Protein backbone atom coordinates (compact mmCIF):
# COMPACT_ATOMS: atom_id res chain seq x y z
CA UNK A 1 0.00 0.00 0.00
CA UNK A 2 3.22 2.08 0.26
CA UNK A 3 3.58 2.87 -3.51
CA UNK A 4 5.51 5.78 -5.22
CA UNK A 5 2.33 6.79 -7.19
CA UNK A 6 -0.30 8.40 -4.85
CA UNK A 7 -3.08 7.46 -7.36
CA UNK A 8 -2.14 3.72 -6.88
CA UNK A 9 -1.91 4.23 -3.05
CA UNK A 10 -5.54 5.54 -2.94
CA UNK A 11 -6.91 2.40 -4.79
CA UNK A 12 -4.72 -0.12 -2.89
CA UNK A 13 -5.74 1.58 0.41
CA UNK A 14 -9.47 0.76 -0.21
CA UNK A 15 -8.78 -2.98 -0.90
CA UNK A 16 -6.24 -3.64 1.94
CA UNK A 17 -7.82 -6.36 4.16
CA UNK A 18 -11.05 -8.37 3.65
CA UNK A 19 -13.94 -6.37 2.02
CA UNK A 20 -17.60 -7.43 2.45
CA UNK A 21 -19.53 -7.90 -0.87
CA UNK A 22 -23.29 -7.65 -1.60
CA UNK A 23 -24.62 -8.76 -5.02
CA UNK A 24 -28.19 -7.95 -6.28
CA UNK A 25 -29.41 -9.19 -9.73
CA UNK A 26 -32.88 -8.68 -11.31
CA UNK A 27 -33.32 -10.93 -14.37
CA UNK A 28 -35.83 -11.70 -17.11
CA UNK A 29 -35.01 -14.66 -19.47
CA UNK A 30 -37.75 -15.44 -22.07
CA UNK A 31 -40.32 -13.86 -19.66
CA UNK A 32 -39.09 -15.83 -16.56
CA UNK A 33 -38.54 -13.04 -13.96
CA UNK A 34 -36.06 -13.88 -11.15
CA UNK A 35 -33.88 -12.22 -8.48
CA UNK A 36 -30.52 -13.32 -6.99
CA UNK A 37 -28.96 -12.04 -3.72
CA UNK A 38 -25.28 -12.69 -2.92
CA UNK A 39 -23.04 -12.11 0.11
CA UNK A 40 -19.41 -12.86 0.85
CA UNK A 41 -15.95 -11.28 1.06
CA UNK A 42 -13.04 -10.35 -1.22
CA UNK A 43 -9.30 -10.30 -0.42
CA UNK A 44 -7.54 -8.49 -3.32
CA UNK A 45 -4.16 -9.31 -1.65
CA UNK A 46 -4.68 -13.00 -2.64
CA UNK A 47 -7.13 -12.28 -5.54
CA UNK A 48 -9.68 -14.37 -3.57
CA UNK A 49 -13.53 -14.09 -3.59
CA UNK A 50 -15.96 -16.28 -1.54
CA UNK A 51 -19.69 -15.70 -2.29
CA UNK A 52 -22.96 -17.53 -1.63
CA UNK A 53 -25.85 -16.65 -4.03
CA UNK A 54 -29.56 -17.36 -3.33
CA UNK A 55 -32.42 -17.23 -5.89
CA UNK A 56 -34.95 -15.15 -3.86
CA UNK A 57 -37.86 -15.81 -6.31
CA UNK A 58 -37.73 -19.67 -5.98
CA UNK A 59 -36.22 -21.95 -8.65
CA UNK A 60 -33.59 -20.29 -10.91
CA UNK A 61 -34.96 -20.61 -14.51
CA UNK A 62 -31.36 -20.84 -15.96
CA UNK A 63 -28.35 -22.94 -14.84
CA UNK A 64 -26.11 -21.26 -12.16
CA UNK A 65 -22.88 -21.66 -14.22
CA UNK A 66 -24.32 -19.27 -16.90
CA UNK A 67 -24.43 -16.38 -14.33
CA UNK A 68 -20.89 -16.78 -12.83
CA UNK A 69 -19.33 -14.05 -15.09
CA UNK A 70 -22.32 -11.65 -14.42
CA UNK A 71 -22.50 -12.17 -10.59
CA UNK A 72 -16.37 -8.06 -9.47
CA UNK A 73 -12.89 -7.79 -11.08
CA UNK A 74 -11.82 -5.04 -8.58
CA UNK A 75 -10.74 -7.98 -6.26
CA UNK A 76 -8.13 -9.17 -8.85
CA UNK A 77 -4.53 -9.46 -7.49
CA UNK A 78 -2.35 -7.05 -9.57
CA UNK A 79 1.37 -7.81 -9.07
CA UNK A 80 3.34 -4.83 -7.67
CA UNK A 81 4.92 -3.99 -11.11
CA UNK A 82 1.39 -3.99 -12.71
CA UNK A 83 -0.62 -1.85 -10.12
CA UNK A 84 -0.45 1.18 -12.51
CA UNK A 85 -2.62 -1.03 -14.82
CA UNK A 86 -5.51 -1.65 -12.30
CA UNK A 87 -8.47 0.31 -13.84
CA UNK A 88 -10.99 -1.47 -11.53
CA UNK A 89 -9.56 -0.22 -8.18
CA UNK A 90 -8.74 3.29 -9.63
CA UNK A 91 -12.51 3.83 -10.40
CA UNK A 92 -13.36 3.40 -6.64
CA UNK A 93 -15.11 4.38 -4.52
CA UNK A 94 -17.50 6.11 -7.05
CA UNK A 95 -17.26 2.89 -9.08
CA UNK A 96 -17.73 1.62 -12.64
CA UNK A 97 -20.43 0.38 -15.04
CA UNK A 98 -19.89 -3.13 -16.44
CA UNK A 99 -21.95 -3.85 -19.61
CA UNK A 100 -21.92 -7.21 -21.44
CA UNK A 101 -23.62 -9.04 -24.28
CA UNK A 102 -23.26 -12.86 -23.91
CA UNK A 103 -24.01 -14.90 -27.08
CA UNK A 104 -24.87 -18.57 -26.33
CA UNK A 105 -23.88 -20.39 -29.56
CA UNK A 106 -27.04 -21.76 -31.35
CA UNK A 107 -29.21 -20.25 -28.54
CA UNK A 108 -30.17 -16.92 -26.86
CA UNK A 109 -28.16 -13.93 -25.58
CA UNK A 110 -27.83 -12.20 -22.17
CA UNK A 111 -27.61 -8.37 -22.02
CA UNK A 112 -26.29 -7.13 -18.62
CA UNK A 113 -25.63 -3.68 -17.07
CA UNK A 114 -24.00 -3.55 -13.60
CA UNK A 115 -22.92 -0.70 -11.25
CA UNK A 116 -20.00 -1.74 -8.97
CA UNK A 117 -19.38 0.81 -6.16
CA UNK A 118 -18.91 1.12 -2.36
CA UNK A 119 -21.92 1.73 -0.04
CA UNK A 120 -19.97 2.64 3.11
CA UNK A 121 -17.51 -0.24 3.76
CA UNK A 122 -19.55 -2.66 1.53
CA UNK A 123 -18.66 -3.32 -2.16
CA UNK A 124 -21.99 -3.57 -4.06
CA UNK A 125 -22.63 -5.23 -7.47
CA UNK A 126 -26.15 -4.19 -8.69
CA UNK A 127 -27.08 -6.01 -11.96
CA UNK A 128 -29.91 -5.86 -14.55
CA UNK A 129 -30.04 -8.96 -16.84
CA UNK A 130 -32.19 -9.43 -19.99
CA UNK A 131 -32.12 -12.78 -21.86
CA UNK A 132 -33.90 -13.14 -25.25
CA UNK A 133 -34.12 -15.67 -28.17
CA UNK A 134 -33.49 -18.80 -25.95
CA UNK A 135 -34.80 -22.25 -27.12
CA UNK A 136 -37.17 -24.04 -24.62
CA UNK A 137 -35.59 -27.43 -25.62
CA UNK A 138 -32.01 -26.00 -25.50
CA UNK A 139 -29.04 -26.45 -23.10
CA UNK A 140 -29.89 -23.32 -20.96
CA UNK A 141 -33.74 -23.40 -20.38
CA UNK A 142 -33.42 -27.24 -20.62
CA UNK A 143 -30.86 -27.24 -17.71
CA UNK A 144 -28.33 -29.53 -19.51
CA UNK A 145 -25.14 -27.82 -18.16
CA UNK A 146 -22.96 -29.61 -15.54
CA UNK A 147 -22.52 -27.88 -12.15
CA UNK A 148 -18.81 -27.01 -12.71
CA UNK A 149 -16.51 -24.29 -14.22
CA UNK A 150 -12.95 -24.09 -15.73
CA UNK A 151 -9.77 -21.89 -15.64
CA UNK A 152 -10.05 -18.96 -18.11
CA UNK A 153 -7.90 -15.95 -19.21
CA UNK A 154 -9.49 -12.52 -20.08
CA UNK A 155 -7.47 -10.09 -22.27
CA UNK A 156 -7.98 -6.45 -21.10
CA UNK A 157 -7.62 -3.51 -23.56
CA UNK A 158 -7.98 0.25 -22.86
CA UNK A 159 -10.73 2.21 -24.64
CA UNK A 160 -9.11 5.73 -24.61
CA UNK A 161 -12.25 7.37 -26.17
CA UNK A 162 -14.57 5.94 -23.39
CA UNK A 163 -11.98 6.44 -20.56
CA UNK A 164 -12.55 2.73 -19.80
CA UNK A 165 -11.63 -0.84 -20.83
CA UNK A 166 -13.09 -3.53 -23.14
CA UNK A 167 -12.61 -7.29 -23.37
CA UNK A 168 -13.86 -10.06 -25.72
CA UNK A 169 -13.64 -13.71 -24.49
CA UNK A 170 -15.15 -17.22 -24.78
CA UNK A 171 -16.49 -19.28 -21.82
CA UNK A 172 -16.95 -23.06 -22.44
CA UNK A 173 -19.71 -24.68 -20.29
CA UNK A 174 -19.68 -28.52 -19.93
CA UNK A 175 -22.88 -30.24 -21.16
CA UNK A 176 -23.87 -33.44 -19.26
CA UNK A 177 -23.38 -35.55 -22.49
CA UNK A 178 -19.64 -34.55 -22.67
CA UNK A 179 -20.19 -31.74 -25.27
CA UNK A 180 -19.61 -27.98 -24.56
CA UNK A 181 -21.89 -24.90 -24.82
CA UNK A 182 -19.86 -21.81 -25.96
CA UNK A 183 -20.72 -18.36 -24.49
CA UNK A 184 -19.14 -15.41 -26.42
CA UNK A 185 -18.75 -12.42 -24.03
CA UNK A 186 -18.39 -8.76 -25.14
CA UNK A 187 -17.53 -6.47 -22.23
CA UNK A 188 -17.04 -2.71 -21.68
CA UNK A 189 -16.35 -0.90 -18.35
CA UNK A 190 -16.70 2.90 -17.85
CA UNK A 191 -16.08 5.04 -14.74
CA UNK A 192 -19.17 6.42 -12.84
CA UNK A 193 -17.14 9.43 -11.49
CA UNK A 194 -15.53 12.32 -13.46
CA UNK A 195 -12.07 11.99 -11.76
CA UNK A 196 -9.06 10.39 -13.49
CA UNK A 197 -8.67 6.56 -13.78
CA UNK A 198 -5.71 4.36 -14.72
CA UNK A 199 -5.95 3.20 -18.36
CA UNK A 200 -3.97 -0.03 -18.71
CA UNK A 201 -1.58 -1.44 -21.32
CA UNK A 202 -2.94 -4.72 -22.80
CA UNK A 203 -2.70 -7.57 -20.21
CA UNK A 204 -4.75 -10.60 -18.97
CA UNK A 205 -6.57 -11.75 -15.79
CA UNK A 206 -6.10 -15.49 -15.00
CA UNK A 207 -9.35 -16.79 -13.34
CA UNK A 208 -10.05 -20.03 -11.39
CA UNK A 209 -13.66 -20.72 -10.22
CA UNK A 210 -14.97 -23.60 -7.98
CA UNK A 211 -18.77 -24.15 -7.54
CA UNK A 212 -20.19 -26.05 -4.53
CA UNK A 213 -23.41 -26.42 -2.49
CA UNK A 214 -24.24 -25.69 1.15
CA UNK A 215 -25.48 -29.07 2.43
CA UNK A 216 -27.82 -27.25 4.96
CA UNK A 217 -29.32 -24.82 2.36
CA UNK A 218 -32.84 -25.73 1.04
CA UNK A 219 -33.16 -22.59 -1.19
CA UNK A 220 -31.85 -22.73 -4.82
CA UNK A 221 -28.24 -21.45 -4.42
CA UNK A 222 -24.56 -21.43 -5.54
CA UNK A 223 -21.37 -21.18 -3.41
CA UNK A 224 -18.50 -19.66 -5.45
CA UNK A 225 -14.73 -19.59 -4.79
CA UNK A 226 -12.83 -17.43 -7.36
CA UNK A 227 -9.11 -16.60 -7.67
CA UNK A 228 -8.26 -13.80 -10.17
CA UNK A 229 -4.59 -12.72 -10.83
CA UNK A 230 -3.35 -10.19 -13.45
CA UNK A 231 -0.40 -11.24 -15.66
CA UNK A 232 1.26 -10.61 -19.05
CA UNK A 233 3.55 -7.63 -18.27
CA UNK A 234 7.08 -8.82 -17.19
CA UNK A 235 9.38 -7.25 -14.50
CA UNK A 236 12.86 -8.72 -15.39
Curated annotation (Swiss-Prot):
Q: Which GO terms describe its biological process?
A: bioluminescence; generation of precursor metabolites and energy
Effect ascribed to mutating residue 107 to E: In mut1.27; shifts fluorescence lifetime from 3.03 to 2.85 ns
Enumerate the UniProt keywords alphabetically: Chromophore, Luminescence, Photoprotein
Substituting residue 149 to C results in: In mut1.9; shifts fluorescence lifetime from 3.03 to 2.74 ns
Superkingdom of the organism of origin: Eukaryota
What is the recorded phenotype of mutating residue 206 to F? In H9; increases fluorescence at 395 nm excitation
Explain what the record says happens when changing residue 83 to R. Answer: In Topaz; shifts the major emission and exitation peak up to 20 nm
Q: What is the effect of changing residue 76 to A?
A: Increases fluorescence at warmer temperatures such as 37 degrees Celsius. In GFPmut 3; highly fluorescent mutant when excited at 488 nm
Q: Outcome of mutating residue 132 to V, per the record? A: In EBFP2.0; shifts the excitation and emission spectra to shorter wavelengths and increases quantum yields compared to BFP
| Impact reported for residue 175 to V | In EBFP1.2; shifts the excitation and emission spectra to shorter wavelengths and increases quantum yields compared to BFP
Which InterPro entries does this chain map to? GFP, GFP-related, Green_fluorescent_prot
Share what the entry says about its subunit structure, partners included: Monomer.
- Cited function: Energy-transfer acceptor. Its role is to transduce the blue chemiluminescence of the protein aequorin into green fluorescent light by energy transfer. Fluoresces in vivo upon receiving energy from the Ca(2+)-activated photoprotein aequorin.
Q: What is this protein called?
A: Green fluorescent protein
